[PDB]
Please model this.
Amino acid sequence: GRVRTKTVKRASKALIERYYPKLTLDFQTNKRLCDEIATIQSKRLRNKIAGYTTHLMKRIQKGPVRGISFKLQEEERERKDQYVPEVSALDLSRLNVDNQTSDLVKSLGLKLPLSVINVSA
Amino acid sequence: TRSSVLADALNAINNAEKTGKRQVLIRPSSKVIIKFLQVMQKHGYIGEFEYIDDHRSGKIVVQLNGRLNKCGVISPRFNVKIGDIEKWTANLLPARQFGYVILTTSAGIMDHEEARRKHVSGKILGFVY
Amino acid sequence: MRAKWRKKRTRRLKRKRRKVRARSK
Amino acid sequence: SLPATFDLTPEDAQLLLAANTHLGARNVQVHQEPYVFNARPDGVHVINVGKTWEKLVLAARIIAAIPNPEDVVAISSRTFGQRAVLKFAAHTGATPIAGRFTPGSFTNYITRSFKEPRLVIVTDPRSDAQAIKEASYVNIPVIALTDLDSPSEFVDVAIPCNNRGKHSIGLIWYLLAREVLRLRGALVDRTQPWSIMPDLYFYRDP
Amino acid sequence: PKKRASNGRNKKGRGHVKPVRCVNCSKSIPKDKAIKRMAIRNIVEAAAVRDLSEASVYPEYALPKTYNKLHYCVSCAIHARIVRVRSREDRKNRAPP
Amino acid sequence: MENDKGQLVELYVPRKCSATNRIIKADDHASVQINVAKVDEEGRAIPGEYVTYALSGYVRSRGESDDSLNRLAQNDGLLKNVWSYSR
Amino acid sequence: GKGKPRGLNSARKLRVHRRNNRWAENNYKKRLLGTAFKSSPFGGSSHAKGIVLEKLGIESKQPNSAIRKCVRVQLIKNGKKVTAFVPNDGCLNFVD
Amino acid sequence: GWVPVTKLGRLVKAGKITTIEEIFLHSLPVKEFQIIDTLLPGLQDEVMNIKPVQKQTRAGQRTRFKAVVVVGDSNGHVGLGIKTAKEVAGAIRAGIIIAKLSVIPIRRGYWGTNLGQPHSLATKTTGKCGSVTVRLIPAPRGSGIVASPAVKKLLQLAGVEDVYTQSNGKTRTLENTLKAAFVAIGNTYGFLTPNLWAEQPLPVSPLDIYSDEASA
Amino acid sequence: VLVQDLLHPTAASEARKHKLKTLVQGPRSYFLDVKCPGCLNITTVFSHAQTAVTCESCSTILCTPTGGKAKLSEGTSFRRK
RNA sequence: AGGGGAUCGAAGAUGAUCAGAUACCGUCGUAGUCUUAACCAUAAACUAUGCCGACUAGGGAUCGGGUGGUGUUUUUUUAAUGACCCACUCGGCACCUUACGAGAAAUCAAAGUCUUUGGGUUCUGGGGGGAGUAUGGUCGCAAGGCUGAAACUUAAAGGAAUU
RNA sequence: GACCCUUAAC
Model:
């Protein structure tokens, strides 16, 4: 049928995970570099890999795809998770507490500015 | 109904010992129970136990160290001759160099080695090891 | 065979034995 | 006897209360948790933040006692803890995992994900059962962030905090890194705060 | 061996529960053991509803429904696929699908 | 056991759980050894100094491991107001 | 309490209970009924002499197929008619 | 050579641990058989029985052989290894590996007055596997190993010379009886005796201090 | 919970449990001094009275039997002990 | 055994099967579920788990009954209460796992505390069959119940899993 | 809707 196997799926995934800036969306210009970048013993096999590489390239072009992570993706992924807000949680983020929370602070012997708001219906 | 308070007390101690708990409540604290515990305490198998004087029958809380492996009751309290002590110790004690068969003699509650040096005998209450 | 019916078969046999013994007793 | 400088400061209090650490679990609470303080109406339990903090310093001391920094492993299957462990593991040796735990990571010596840790930290005992369960095969202690209804089995140290708040889970992970570093000496000034803030440890979806 | 802890029924603390007759075959089955399903159906079968409504003398007619508690024996419940044979583990799911 | 005539015997005198004082078996892989570091007047963990607790696999599987550690270390004084005797 | 009575004065119940339940043992029942004495053809003896009445061709039970050589023997002391195997090969020609 | 893949396997390879009692002291998990055969260089293996097991299939029965192997030096250590393989020779080798991997210490005691070296067991001990339980009773000198040959060989491979044995259940189920005996033989260190009521101190574990010998 | 102070339970824990399950069983009921309006006629009433108590002066019923604690009549005042 | 007999319906005739179908399916239809001196006394009468007592883990719900919350809502609207909500508690029907423990396993809140074997006590079993078959006795109007063998014959019968 | 059976012969 139309489904392809692991030997072309992992090979295509491995190439993209390593050779991302060298290949692109077009099949014809991806065939020319796939047969010189990776030793592929068959004309039919190399055709299949180049087709699955450009297939994932089209998918990568619109949003990240689970499973594949190249150097450019993971580098920008880090920049996303280093972000920190400027404002603090302590100030107006737009001390709420209850009776039991409020006396907990007093049992612990701490003085904090907190408004005792009981369960109002 | 309740037949042997010593059996329920020793069961409570055994079930507390098996679950790792360092203390156990005992109801209803007969004098035979206390004597059985003092023999246990003298050999170091339990620790401290406190009698609680509710005006009815008494309660015991026993502190438990980790030493007691099994305490038990022998029911009925079989008559034990001097010559029958060997059969009882060899039947239920884990070894020869440790463990005690506790028996009630006319000289009081005692373990088997104390009944051997005092040369007394009577009825078997239980064991501890 | 089914134990229910073997019980029934034996009961019919017992009934016949009671009848055949009655004609001599 | 602590040197009386590890006590819960008022700033760390407000950090916990704003993060809603004290807000305990639902109408269900585990009898192995004496961390409850003065449940409020509507069934919401309030967690004694002092015990949370006190256990937090205790957990840090156990972490600091491990000689190799990487020999500790942080484990988080939940989404809210996934970012926190990596940020926590960034500031210490702490070879972490995030997302799915691979069965056979503690046993199965020839697996590619093998870990030989001396201490395992897990964000959620219920959601990280496999990590805790496999930790009971290879003689390794476990530190866990446990809510008032958490399955405390095989957990040596439990830090009481709500598991239904991304702010409090991230904050406890943040405080764990800060305390561990303060003991190790990376944060020399006990009184002065940390330049890194708890909002670095929090989660974000998009 | 024992297949179910509930013995295929719902009777703990009774001894006897009155029978009900199956609606397919009229088999006598204890009520606690029957496979009762409650049928609430529109009376016009939902494909003639517009034909009935457009032929109705009343606007916005309520269109009443029919209510029937249907009881099945185990044989008829299984045959009519009211219930199906389930794996040993997931026999313990009381929650309806 | 050890008799008088030397005779080095009773190999492998085993550990005992701190909470329950029961013998840790040679293959009881659910038991842990908790190392709680010490701090000397400056909030900095002095190397090689820690109070050690053996924790049996039995209590770990029972969920009492957390309660045991709070009681043990409080008795040793490195937690202050966590464990209550009267529960 | 394990079923059986345990009281120090329950020796009679334990004795009578054991007596009744030894009857479920095949050997005790056979011995105390005297079945060998009253029913067995040797009358309870190891051996018996008798007179050969006829040569036998008892067929083998499945799955083996063979003709076991036996003799009808009327025992002298009883008159009971039994069947005795003639064991070895060709020994039928000795016990004609 | 060996190239162990484990911290404990590294430590024994590096020579920083020389006693198997030190592995048993801290309940360390052992996952390589090579660490057993270096720390106990006098282990003698044996085979108690070899039996085939068959899984019925659509076309015939697939026959596999279950090898039972008992491993131990003649003083204080014993192991038990069961492995079913497609070939008997393969099963023996793998069942040896499991038998060494499962080696446990033995607590030998005296029947009385602690005169010479321990000849017997310190306590009565029992272990159960399936319907089989094996009871081990201390014996005086010269009594020998009063046990069936299969139980006896494992027990003399443990280092005990005087013992009484008592069994019930399917003793003919050999694998269960040896596993029941292995548990009873293993439970000899679980039993707490008054002479073992001693002090706590429990020094540092080998893996914590010698962690400098990690994969690096 | 392996280690517990069974000699000194908390008052909250003792008060929570059944009256026969405390360390030493004690009655949770109490006696109360009830007076009708006007004339003092102080009558001591059991909390779980179970009989309609009227003061010694006249027919001035002070409580109504209930499955648990006796409910006091509409016009009256009570003091504990 | 007198009264009632609607319904359904052991017994009792058509159709399919054909080698039948005196079965399963249709239609009928007698006896058969009320009161007795009334009898009978058996069921997979099952939880296939004897009863009493103690102890041993978790978590919610429910039925009763109490206790505490000036909790929410209710005649003549916020002047007896009731019905709901939380927290306890006693008793009960039960309820989520190849779970410490037990078990041959299935599985088990007891089927645990049992070779580390003893709380009290009743009943029952000792390979399969012959056989729950009486030479007997006893109860019953009968049907039958209870009690209950032997000869003889067998290497298995059986339980729970696995494939 | 109907659908019974299956070697003594290594």
